Design a binder for this molecule. Structure first.
Ligand SMILES: CN(C)c1ccc(C(=C2C=CC(=[N+](C)C)C=C2)c2ccccc2)cc1
Lengths: 186, 186
């Protein structure tokens, strides 16, 4: 719980001041813990952050599990999962901390190892869709693993670098992408 | 020179270190200059950045012209563009700094002028390609501007969120994408 409290407090601080501005001092002092207990649970700020990301990751996966009930077929799932990514990220509180963190340790192979396992989970979602799609003749894909990585990265770019138009138009583009990409399969 | 050494050290900084991580101070310190010269064309960190950006975009659009000839059919122009994006040393190595910058100075307006101008050269390459493809009957797109934006961003996603894994796999993935995207256009 002292650990859970650290995670909880830390999260709010990152949300409030981004990754860089947040100090383990604050986290310690605000969660009424100690540098010693923090170091024992996470060693470094980098790591602490990574765990929070892991936890958020599971919340997302859990939200998806419930949200996909609105999408019957796998082609629909693809449409919905992308839509979701776009909208949720628009107002995700940690988004800012993530950017900071990401663009700081993406050069360091150390803090890039754990980051991979995390991203893979995110891709996994797609792997599932395309695979279940094969068992339903919605499409026939030779190597799911490749397409999955492609969709995941193409969708995120469309999400990250689109920042400029009204959310309404964004969805339209995102859905157009789904349409096209799903059509480039078959 | 002076004004150029700025854009130089500034660029080298914006890439290696993040956007926020780089400051006017670090400049003059490694640029051996003053903190006042920054004003005639550099009204703020933004303009200095939005400037270096535009410059690099040009550096990239230049290489593209000198090399696009290797591709005959527009279907090839598309593939070559996306492949080159992965190997260039222009503009793309700043996407990080860019993301970051888009989560801070995206409220002001006096900047969104130089901004959108640059977001044009970004999708223009695709506008030409797709359009010239409508003539040669290589495909039929009745919404070039949309598809253009979609592709530019999708591709940018692939370049950016893979910069850490085998450059060979990168090219492989990128081409597998171009194939699918194009195959989904008709
Ligand atoms: C809040 N939310 C749902 C999400 C939040 C972030 C991501 C991201 C990402 C991009 C490409 C990935 N791939 C394909 C390796 C994995 C993750 C991501 C976006 C910007 C910077 C770093 C990573 C995804 C979903």
């Amino acid at each position: 719980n002292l650990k859970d409290k650290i995670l909880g407090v830390a999260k709010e601080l990152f949300i409030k001041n981004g990754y860089n501005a947040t100090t383990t001092g604050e986290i310690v002092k605000l969660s009424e813990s100690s540098k010693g207990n923090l170091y024992y649970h996470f060693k470094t700020k980098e790591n602490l952050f990574l765990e929070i990301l892991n936890i958020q990751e599971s919340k997302w996966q859990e939200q998806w599990k419930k949200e996909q009930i609105k999408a019957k077929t796998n082609r629909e799932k693809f449409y919905l999962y992308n839509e979701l990514s776009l909208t949720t990220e628009y107002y995700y509180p940690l988004q800012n901390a993530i950017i900071e963190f990401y663009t700081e340790y993406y050069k360091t192979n150390s803090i890039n190892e754990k980051m991979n396992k995390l991203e893979n989970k995110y891709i996994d979602a797609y792997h599932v869709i395309f695979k279940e799609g094969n068992l339903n003749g919605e499409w026939s894909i030779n190597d799911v693993n490749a397409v999955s990585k492609i969709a995941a990265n193409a969708v995120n770019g469309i999400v990250t670098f689109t920042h400029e138009q009204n959310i309404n138009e964004r969805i339209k583009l995102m859905n157009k992408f789904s349409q096209i990409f799903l059509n480039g399969l078959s």
